[PDB]
Amino acid sequence: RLQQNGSNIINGVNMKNTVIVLYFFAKWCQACTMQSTEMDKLQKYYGKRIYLLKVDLDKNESLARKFSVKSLPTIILLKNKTMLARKDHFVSSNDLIALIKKH
Hints:
Membrane topology: Peripheral membrane protein
GO cellular component, one term: symbiont-containing vacuole membrane
Subunit structure: Monomer. Component of the Plasmodium translocon of exported proteins (PTEX) complex composed of HSP101, EXP2, PTEX150, PTEX88 and TRX2.
CATH superfamily: Glutaredoxin
Largest sheet: 4 strands, mixed
GO molecular function, one term: protein-disulfide reductase activity
Order of helices and strands: EHEHEEH
Protein name: Thioredoxin 2
Distance between the termini: 36 Å
């Protein structure tokens, strides 16, 4: 059971090739709460055209460390396991759309 799986996206294994939005955050972090609100709009607009992965840094230093997060919020965009863009501070959903919509 739980057997190991293949890649269509390296982070989300065994499913699909879409644009995943990896967002690092912390509950205590005020700068984030404003962004999370943004992600909600972003999620609604793109629906399933993208996948949002929200990461709580407080619970995964391992990963943040791997991705070298130096601030919150951090937003990284990946398609086909190649980083498309990165933001190390707040971005608007509208801004997010624009960057995303390149692809």
